[PDB]
Design an enzyme around this catalytic site. Structure first.
Site, PDB file in Angstrom:
ATOM      1  N   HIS B  41     -19.934  27.230 -75.866  1.00 43.58           N
ATOM      2  CA  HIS B  41     -20.518  28.387 -75.206  1.00 43.58           C
ATOM      3  C   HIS B  41     -21.375  29.101 -76.018  1.00 43.58           C
ATOM      4  O   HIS B  41     -21.839  30.262 -75.493  1.00 43.58           O
ATOM      5  CB  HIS B  41     -19.294  29.149 -74.548  1.00 43.58           C
ATOM      6  CG  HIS B  41     -18.646  30.160 -75.470  1.00 43.58           C
ATOM      7  ND1 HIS B  41     -17.123  30.072 -75.655  1.00 43.58           N
ATOM      8  CD2 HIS B  41     -19.014  31.131 -76.342  1.00 43.58           C
ATOM      9  CE1 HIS B  41     -16.994  31.083 -76.527  1.00 43.58           C
ATOM     10  NE2 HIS B  41     -18.095  31.660 -76.861  1.00 43.58           N
ATOM     11  N   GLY B 143     -16.837  38.934 -81.045  1.00 43.86           N
ATOM     12  CA  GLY B 143     -17.484  38.263 -82.284  1.00 43.86           C
ATOM     13  C   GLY B 143     -16.564  37.245 -83.205  1.00 43.86           C
ATOM     14  O   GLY B 143     -17.142  36.362 -84.005  1.00 43.86           O
ATOM     15  N   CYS B 145     -14.829  34.633 -81.858  1.00 46.59           N
ATOM     16  CA  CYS B 145     -15.114  33.546 -81.560  1.00 46.59           C
ATOM     17  C   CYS B 145     -15.373  32.507 -82.257  1.00 46.59           C
ATOM     18  O   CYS B 145     -16.407  32.763 -83.189  1.00 46.59           O
ATOM     19  CB  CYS B 145     -15.995  33.091 -80.282  1.00 46.59           C
ATOM     20  SG  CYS B 145     -15.503  33.883 -78.970  1.00 46.59           S
TER      21      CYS B 145
END
Lengths: 306, 302
Positions: B41, B143, B145
């Site tokens: 993503h 942040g 991820c």
């Protein structure tokens, strides 16, 4: 989102952990440049611990008395000396993995990460706090001596703790990295025991601020209190007395939330007298006291290292 | 002595942490040998995340659409592909710090360490368990991820989790290192929410055993129970039904403490019915379920 008690990344410290053997005693050493620091009682056994003469026991030991191991590499000891309760072994190899570091003596209530080792092999990492009674509630088995606690800021590893012993209640005692014990304790088998202990009020307030920063704020109220009146209540619940210095330390968190410290005390006071009523703060049914004003800024304000 | 929610030392993972950027979007990635893994993503934007078609989004990208950096230094991308919900980015350099590792998919109820990172730089490490409902109760900020979860047995790192998203309840979701989501979640902005949850019975029992190993046994009692009768009570308290498999797993701790599993169950049964009474267990005022039997054996005295 969510609230964990986080340790520092342990990589920079993992790189410094070695195994130190002397006779049949094996524990952990801390390797920085060309010096290995370890607990002096690595030269001890049984009744030695029953009131040992360190100057003297050391004298019968030579360099080749200490086996030092980093992974598989054997490190040749070319010098030894004693520094307070620490042994300092000079080795022929400067640690290629030495981080930027310093040695600081930690103040009570303050926190640090502990890297539990056994045989020079790091096994786990966890946060703890230096208790007001000068002990740490750690998790140590046999052979954990020499494990260290630390903080990081930027690129600098600040070592503040080295583990030496276990007190009768199963809490732990140790030294700064100059070999000076925290608290009254000594590195012998004696009757020494942990004093009574209190809840770290400064940390509870820090944590209450963290809750507010996270939007978890049901406990706030419209009232305030004098320092003196807070301490009368708080101490009835075995909380450390709040000093004017603790208040100043909560300044940044206070400013950031626009909630004055004594206003937060009024909230805490109410929480202690009436409890939480089945509700929770930051997911907890209990008031957390192992989270400092600095841990809060660190965890809440995404800091990295480095 | 003592009992801590212990994470694995994180240094073997730190050495693998990188930053992956695409467009305006940055997050973390895992750099193993010559390949960098990160959440797919990262290629999405605004209304992309409302209803992304990843095959269609990715085909519009080239290798140079991706900026990968180790610290301050750029790694040149020379290949890219999609594996379920991850991107695999081949780079031109190999990571010398790559540890012996493997990818494993973990079962609900198991624990692991997470190394929370922002911008491909380590922030902190913590231990957690995957919920029965497949979510984890974590501490993440925007942040994080691409941050990973792992276990270390010996010198070999087993990666089990990559962080993808935060749910409405503030609990978090992600995938194994092959891109398969844990739980019924997808990498879009849908109305998906965490499913019903249960307390991890097996873990609770192991923790009770840890307490006994620590010389504490106030909660014990003179009864035993049938598996069947334990479940009839525990399931009323939102507890995960306990199986014979769970019982067998508890063998080593049972043998060591001399307390029979069903007797320990009878103890837990009473604790549920009567509560803890202001008393603590391993310093806790509530029953802990984030320590597996294996965690206890690893941490506690033998």
């Amino acid at each position: 989102s969510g609230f964990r008690k986080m340790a520092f990344p342990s990589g920079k410290v993992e790189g410094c952990m070695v195994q130190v053997t002397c006779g049949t005693t094996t524990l952990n050493g801390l390797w920085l440049d060309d010096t290995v620091y370890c607990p002096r009682h690595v030269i001890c056994t049984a009744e030695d611990m029953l009131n040992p003469n360190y100057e003297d026991l050391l004298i019968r030991k030579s360099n080749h008395s200490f086996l030092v191991q980093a992974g598989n590499v054997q490190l040749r000891v070319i010098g030894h000396s004693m520094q307070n309760c620490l042994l300092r072994l000079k080795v022929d190899t400067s640690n290629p993995k030495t981080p930027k570091y310093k040695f600081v003596r930690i103040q009570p209530g303050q926190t640090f990460s502990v890297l539990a080792c056994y045989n020079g092999s790091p096994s786990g990492v966890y946060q703890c706090a230096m208790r007001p009674n000068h002990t740490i509630k750690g998790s140590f088995l046999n052979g954990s001596c020499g494990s260290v606690g630390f903080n990081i800021d930027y690129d600098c590893v600040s070592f503040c703790y080295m583990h030496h012993m276990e007190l009768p209640t199963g809490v732990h005692a140790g030294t700064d990295l100059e070999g000076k014990f925290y608290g009254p304790f000594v590195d012998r088998q004696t009757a020494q025991a942990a004093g009574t202990d209190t809840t770290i009020t400064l940390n509870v307030l820090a944590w209450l601020y963290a809750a507010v920063i996270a939007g978890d704020r049901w406990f706030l109220n419209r009232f305030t209190t004098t320092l003196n009146d807070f301490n009368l209540v708080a101490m009835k619940y075995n909380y450390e007395p709040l000093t004017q210095d603790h208040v100043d330390i909560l300044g940044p968190l206070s400013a950031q939330t626009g909630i004055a410290v004594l206003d937060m005390c009024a909230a805490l006071k109410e929480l202690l007298q009436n409890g939480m009523n089945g509700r929770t703060i930051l997911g907890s049914t209990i008031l957390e006291d192992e989270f400092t004003p600095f841990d809060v800024v660190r965890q809440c304000s995404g800091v990295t290292f480095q």
